[PDB]
From a paper:
Here we show that the [name] gene we name cysteine-rich [name] (CRUOX) encodes a functional protein representing a unique case of cysteine enrichment in the evolution of vertebrate orthologous genes. CRUOX retains the ability to catalyze urate oxidation to hydrogen peroxide and 5-hydroxyisourate (HIU), albeit with a 100-fold reduced efficiency. However, differently from all uricases hitherto characterized, it can also facilitate urate regeneration from HIU, a catalytic property that we propose depends on its enrichment in cysteine residues. X-ray structural analysis highlights differences in the active site compared to known orthologs and suggests a mechanism for cysteine-mediated self-aggregation under H2O2-oxidative conditions.
Numbering used by the authors:
A (entry chain DDD): 0 to 300
B (entry chain CCC): 3 to 301
C (entry chain BBB): 4 to 301
D (entry chain AAA): 3 to 300
Write the structure that this text describes.
Amino acid sequence: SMSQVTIKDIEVLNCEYGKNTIKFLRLHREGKKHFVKEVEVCTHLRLTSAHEYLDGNNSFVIPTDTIKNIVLVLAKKNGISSIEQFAIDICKHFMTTFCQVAYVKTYIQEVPWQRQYQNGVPHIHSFILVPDGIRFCEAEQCRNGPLVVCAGIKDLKLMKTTQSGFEGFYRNEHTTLPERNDRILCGEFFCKWSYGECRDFDFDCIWSKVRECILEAFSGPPDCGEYSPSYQRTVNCIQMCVLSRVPQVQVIEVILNNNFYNVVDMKALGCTNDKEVLVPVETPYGSCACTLGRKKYLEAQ
Amino acid sequence: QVTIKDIEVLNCEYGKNTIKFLRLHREGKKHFVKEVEVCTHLRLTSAHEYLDGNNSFVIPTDTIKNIVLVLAKKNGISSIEQFAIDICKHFMTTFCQVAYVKTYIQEVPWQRQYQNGVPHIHSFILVPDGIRFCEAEQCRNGPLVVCAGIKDLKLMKTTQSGFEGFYRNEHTTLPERNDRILCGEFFCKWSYGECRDFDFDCIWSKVRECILEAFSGPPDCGEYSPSYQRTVNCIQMCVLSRVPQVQVIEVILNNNFYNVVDMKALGCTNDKEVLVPVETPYGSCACTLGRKKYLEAQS
Amino acid sequence: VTIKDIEVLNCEYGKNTIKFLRLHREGKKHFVKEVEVCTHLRLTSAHEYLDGNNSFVIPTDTIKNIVLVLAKKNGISSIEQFAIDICKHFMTTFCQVAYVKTYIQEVPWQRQYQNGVPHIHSFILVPDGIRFCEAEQCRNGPLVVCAGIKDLKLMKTTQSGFEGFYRNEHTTLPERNDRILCGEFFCKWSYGECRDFDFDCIWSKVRECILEAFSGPPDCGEYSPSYQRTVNCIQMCVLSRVPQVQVIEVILNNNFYNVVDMKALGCTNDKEVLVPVETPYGSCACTLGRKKYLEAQS
Amino acid sequence: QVTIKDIEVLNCEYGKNTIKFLRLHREGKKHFVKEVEVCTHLRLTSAHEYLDGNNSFVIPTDTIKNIVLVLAKKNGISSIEQFAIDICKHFMTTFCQVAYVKTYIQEVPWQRQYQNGVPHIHSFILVPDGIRFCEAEQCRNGPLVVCAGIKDLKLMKTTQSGFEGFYRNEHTTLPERNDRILCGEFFCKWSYGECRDFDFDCIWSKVRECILEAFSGPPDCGEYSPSYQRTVNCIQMCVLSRVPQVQVIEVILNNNFYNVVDMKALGCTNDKEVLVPVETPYGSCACTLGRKKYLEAQ
Ligand SMILES: O=c1[nH]c(=O)c2nn[nH]c2[nH]1
Ligand SMILES: O=c1[nH]c(=O)c2nn[nH]c2[nH]1
Ligand SMILES: O=c1[nH]c(=O)c2nn[nH]c2[nH]1
Ligand SMILES: O=c1[nH]c(=O)c2nn[nH]c2[nH]1
Ligand SMILES: [Br-]
Ligand SMILES: [Br-]
Ligand SMILES: [Cl-]
Ligand SMILES: [Cl-]
Ligand SMILES: [Cl-]
Ligand SMILES: [Cl-]
Ligand SMILES: [Cl-]
Ligand SMILES: [Cl-]
Ligand SMILES: [Cl-]
Ligand SMILES: [Cl-]
Ligand SMILES: [Cl-]
Ligand SMILES: [Cl-]
Ligand SMILES: [Cl-]
């Protein structure tokens, strides 16, 4: 119909920009005892207009360099009591300082530094990297909308060697999977939960409590464990534990990426392999994901 | 144009890489796991597969994988070191066309889960706090040598570290510093030579404790490091002083500088409060120390 | 005054210092375990005290016979397993037993060696700290096992002080940052009901923790600012490195070594000649337990 | 009634007992300890302190202690034998009134601690596996004689022992036995006479090796003992064959019989499995052997 499209022909469905992987360590000294919080911050903005795209005019653009500067200044002046409070302080600063900001999102993850110990005695200033699951949070706010905070844990890899099966599934001409009532259940978990606009609690304490719920629901009691009839059922058991034990959690998303461990057939090698040697299949891999919300929280919107 | 008689075969080696498996063991309802990654390489007495297209002497890399899995099944894995020994011994004593065998093993760092200080019978969590590995090798008619190690071990102290009194030249702009963050990623490897009259797990743990303690110093005051290099030496001398089984120790320290961000132009003072890691480029230092007694004793 | 005015707070009886050697032979090679056993009972009634009625009393002679028969029939893999077997035997054999406690200590026989070769059947007494254990059970309550080391005498010649202590008008002790630290230790630890480990292995591991924490590393040692702090270092080492230990009790009986004033004798004594003071002597004692374990009891 | 005229002084002797001290020596960071118990006794050339109440010639026992401590400080202690020699020589050269001096010394058995085969610079553990002692004595204008020994040495073998073919009378109920536990606590003491041209520590260790090897026999099979008395002879003949410095050797063996408990009345057979030691009463035997040449040469 026409030889080109012009602004009049097209709708801007989304415009977003920001600064990614702002890495720094906040050091706090109480005499000779040293405290560290090392983080990675992503902060993204949507502006009220798109002249920098549509017209080649930068008048309203806050440089991403400025976004980095603000994150480092706020760390210096405010410290970091929790990554959640820091994500909140960043979002509130952008919304209050810059009228051209329609929307702000701050994602933060912690570098998993632990204090070193010598026969139970905490070291004043020495640390070791211990990645047993990465702590993150995310704060976002629309102009004239609520400031919403999420916390989570990712790269969390749990494995139980029994009390796991997958049976009674749908069968068809392309379904060769045998029924199994014993197998290794190996999952890499991404867990993310919403507090909504709630802030009246200790962020670090509540995060720890959720992490506990995830490990406990996954494992079952330490003397006997608990049967899992699917990866999916195990995801629901985790979500329902967190919701049952942590009232501040309004919505919870859990993604389980599984690895199957095959009992190697050793008959041609002159052996019987009685669930002794198991080879992980890393690709392809199965995943399942569910998001559960409290009826009260969702209806209250 | 060029023929077999103009060229010398300096080296021929082949193997199977990244053989991954979990060895499961049950004592009633209590389950135990060892998950490993194994490389095994061979040198053969002839090179006909390369020079002539004749495979008669070649043990398939598929067979190397089958043997590793069969040995894990029949022998179990008490320690990765004993399993590395078992694999090298099997190749040496089974195949007369093997001139040399090398097995590398690394553990997947599964930890048993705890609820209220009670250990879980069959539930585990992945906790990398430094990757345990080992390596066994042997030439025909030569010692079976065992090495153990820890890698991807990232240690950081926020004080008791400087670098001063260095060599000055026209291209040297580095300031002298007596307070900086010391952050290093360590690769540590040590040889037991032929000795195996000790508990591999116990001695591996002891060397690890030596590394952490020599790095950190005492927990109430720490200990001043005047260079990355001096910290490497304190680790090595601590291990050799406390672990006679260690004959030779190699330590590599890959460091990250943490820069106190100049916040002047932002109207801020930064008194060592906000520090930015420089990941690339990065400094390295490496040292191998050996006991004179062990070195001289090799005829 | 009458039985009606009087409460029986406690009644207990038993057989003490039951001494025997259990000999085991694998062809030419002999193995020994020589022990001393005490076994005490509390009965469900006190008719022997209150009425002169012995109908419920198991003779202490029978307690000895039972200890000797079980050693014969069961052998002794570990003193802890033997103590368990004796408590279990009393609880299943005699319903009038309300409570049983068995204490066992090992006679410290070591196999003799000649130029590195172990002797098939010859031993030497080597007391380097006496191994003991204790098992006890109430009727329908848990069987609890403790192991320990006593008469363990350790000494370091430096890396010991006592400074910054409370001063008053009767305090003449000077501040010291260098002294001999000499202690006789009693150490006892509870496994609770946990029994799924090698008793000998774990005992050896706790012993090594005690010596290493007392001494510090062999190339430099470790400063002790008090006997009390050294007790704490030993306990925290054991608890940090041995998960099976739930509760640990350490008693340190110290001996002061005085640098003799030889000025009157025309001599300077630069910490060269030291005289030990055996009485009076100082003691300190601490019991630490895992919070998780102590909560799980209540 | 009776006066000095009617009575003869057969013997007078006095001294200081249990003088305890530690001698500490430092080579850089490395500490060396020798802790000893010293007894020093004198006979004087007169007895006026007893007979007349005149103390003019008495050296206070407090002075004997001061001299032992002063000599430890000034000389150090290379060996307890050299220290005992130095004490006797001091009393003889210093005091006109000394007719006779005897010095007895025993070592406190401190052993350096080891961690994973590494010797600790300054930490020790008490390990009493046979107490080292010595004794020096001298009459005025007579030879200074030195003895060394080992006591409280407890050895046990579980077979290769019997006692048969002994004298029988109407009061003899002991059965012939060809297979018993041989358990002895040994006191061994030997004389070097006046010879001192050797390493005292070296030679003491050699004698101790000889006692353990002769008691035990070879590690692969042992050696049959037909009595305690013949084991004492084997020990002595082994020392005299292998250690030419030893002129005279005394060995005292205090034995403990281990009874195979008769368990027929308890429904059991006891096939040398459970044995009970008899600590009292107890048998002893003692022999002193000397080289003909040294006994003639007196
Ligand atoms: O638990 C399981 N869920 C699934 O959806 C599935 N698909 N293959 N195996 C499976 N196991
Ligand atoms: O400790 C240090 N060693 C070095 O070699 C170096 N080079 N730059 N900074 C350094 N710091
Ligand atoms: O370490 C010590 N603790 C004490 O309680 C004490 N009392 N005197 N000396 C002492 N030394
Ligand atoms: O060896 C022995 N000697 C004795 O003199 C003796 N007397 N009873 N048993 C004995 N055994
Ligand atoms: Br021996
Ligand atoms: Br030791
Ligand atoms: Cl640590
Ligand atoms: Cl497979
Ligand atoms: Cl070839
Ligand atoms: Cl856990
Ligand atoms: Cl700096
Ligand atoms: Cl060396
Ligand atoms: Cl043995
Ligand atoms: Cl002092
Ligand atoms: Cl007289
Ligand atoms: Cl007999
Ligand atoms: Cl001989």
